[PDB]
Ligand binder design. Structure first.
Ligand code: HEM
Ligand code: HEM
Ligand code: HEM
Ligand code: HEM
Lengths: 146, 141, 141, 146
């Protein structure tokens, strides 16, 4: 994809203010509460019995930190996105068998969360750039689906 | 399937937004036309410039329809049957578009009422948007 | 939303298949596990070899559930509420899988009863599969 | 994607027996009857007022012939799929603004139709190969969506 220099500015400006730990924990926890079938893949996380238990399960928090850290590697290398997620594609596609449509549900949850953390700074143009980023990230992960 | 708590959660956040329909429905159309430009294709006749007054006005009518299904949440199909013919039959909107609209709406309520938007209200509000989507596309299935 | 003609069209093709549940439900599981191997993940415990007898048996139970919603088509949720808890809550099936299952079923009825499957029965049968999908995933929304 | 030599055999054997005119006409007509919002893009085709009118509209038949002919160019060049559909991607993506999920609904309809024309010769392994083909074709058309 082509990235304009201003898209790159809206992605980088924003990223620097992100609390990765808290935003990652919130986003994973909302993926599991809002779309309950995703809980099937995290059977190893133990108790996901309630949203309240999901919210404070330490493996959901830890793991959340780690998925948002991957978003960061994309933010840093906006042009080598393929190589960055190539090993991740095989794990999610080949090993976990996650359908690519949950890759989209998760980036959409990220946008909602960054919106709730940035309020009005998350402008419609800022929204747009981030929507493209999650879409390109969702696309690099669905790629070993060939 | 909206449970009793879903219904309440929805009512709950709609009280905080029932007061700003026009600024909230306009903002959601504006993010929709900006993050998903392919939706602009359905409003060839409108001026689509930030703050156009046709966006404000339509914005205002989009969220009153919402409020009205909140209000008849027990039978959203029945309270919205004229809108279902307009979008499915007359306008022929592709169903994917309703998910673009529903998402730009969550995004407005998180920017403006973050705390109202907890993970569980988040889940109720999503099933609701989805119920409205399904009813507005219903003369398709 | 199943109209009167939809309901009939469904009844119509189900009469031609109500006689071969086991060969038809097995064939549909077999094409599902073959065209969409990621669905095999939900039957770790079964023997998944062509003609395994667990496939035949389950095949037979999948289409009787169908026949039974045909039969209570007026309230598919109500007639299938125990299956909705099994798939949504216990099994946690991802919704996309129901569209894989529904499609391998259309494919069996076209191979075997082509003429029954006109473009309009095709449309009724699809809204039906989709209604069953939605009910079986309902404790998710 | 990798194509096995036997996948290529199941795609080619089958393709040679296809009536392109009748299969294309049937598939376009079912796309428009089964998924009615797709009728919006063919507003220029005139009368699509009923399934019966949709079934005998001469522009639906003609156009159907043409979409199945494109499937054939894929069948012939299974390895240059990108170049083959590159101009088509821009028309559907850039000009028509069709969402990629209708690209999937249409290949699924193709499989149903070829199944109704081939009966038992359309084996589950044959089903599978064709499912991969429509998936790669749907993917080459969604590509200028970057
Ligand atoms: C596009 C968004 C996604 C990104 C960036 C992402 C990223 C990651 C990363 C970095 C890992 C950790 C690997 C390691 O540390 O070895 C991981 C693992 C995993 N992901 Fe994702 N993921 C995404 C989407 C999903 C979705 C939607 C699901 C489920 C529906 C999922 C399920 C899993 C599971 C089950 C694991 C392994 C957990 C474990 O082994 O402890 N991923 N993902
Ligand atoms: C939650 C989903 C939606 C709701 C409640 C909704 C609400 C409305 C209302 C209330 C009207 C009638 C306005 C009037 O009488 O002036 C309308 C019309 C319209 N809608 Fe929707 N809408 C929704 C989603 C969509 C989507 C996703 C699209 C297409 C992207 C769409 C396209 C249109 C168009 C083009 C019109 C006609 C506007 C005009 O002619 O000025 N709607 N909608
Ligand atoms: C039209 C959609 C479906 C229908 C009517 C249906 C029907 C059934 C029935 C009747 C049972 C209970 C069987 C018993 O009591 O022995 C069952 C269980 C089961 N279903 Fe479904 N099913 C459908 C779709 C799916 C899909 C798409 C999946 C996953 C890919 C799935 C996965 C399972 C599994 C793993 C079981 C348990 C089987 C066992 O434990 O032996 N089902 N289904
Ligand atoms: C993946 C499957 C598809 C293939 C192979 C395909 C192929 C084609 C081809 C070969 C053309 C003709 C271009 C020309 O002759 O200049 C065309 C045009 C077109 N396609 Fe598709 N198409 C596909 C999917 C879709 C879908 C799903 C839609 C609508 C939902 C669509 C809507 C159109 C329209 C409106 C036109 C132009 C009609 C005209 O200008 O007369 N296409 N497509």
């Amino acid at each position: 994809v082509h990235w304009s220099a201003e898209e790159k500015q809206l992605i980088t400006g924003l990223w620097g203010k992100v609390n990765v730990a808290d935003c990652g924990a919130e986003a994973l926890a909302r993926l599991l509460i809002v779309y309950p079938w995703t809980q099937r893949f995290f059977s190893s996380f133990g108790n996901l019995s309630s949203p309240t238990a999901i919210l404070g399960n330490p493996m959901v928090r830890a793991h959340g930190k780690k998925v948002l850290t991957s978003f960061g590697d994309a933010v840093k290398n906006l042009d080598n996105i393929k190589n960055t997620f190539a090993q991740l594609s095989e794990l999610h596609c080949d090993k976990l068998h996650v359908d690519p449509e949950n890759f989209r549900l998760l980036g959409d949850i990220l946008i909602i969360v960054l919106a709730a953390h940035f309020a009005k700074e998350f402008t419609p143009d800022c929204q747009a750039a981030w929507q493209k980023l999650v879409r390109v990230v969702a696309h690099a992960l669905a790629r070993k689906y060939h | 399937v909206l449970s009793a708590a879903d219904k309440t959660n929805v009512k709950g956040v709609f009280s905080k937004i029932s007061g700003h329909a026009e600024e909230y429905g306009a903002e959601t159309l504006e993010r929709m036309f900006t993050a998903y430009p392919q939706t602009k294709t359905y409003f060839p006749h409108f001026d689509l410039q930030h703050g156009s007054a046709q966006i404000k006005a339509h914005g205002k009518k989009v969220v009153a329809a919402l409020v009205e299904a909140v209000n008849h949440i027990d039978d959203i199909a029945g309270a919205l049957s004229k809108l279902s013919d307009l979008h499915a039959q007359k306008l022929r909107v592709d169903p994917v578009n309703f998910k673009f609209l529903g998402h730009c709406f969550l995004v407005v309520v998180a920017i403006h009422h973050p705390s109202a938007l907890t993970a569980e209200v988040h889940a109720s509000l999503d099933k609701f948007l989805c119920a409205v989507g399904t009813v507005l596309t219903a003369k398709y299935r």
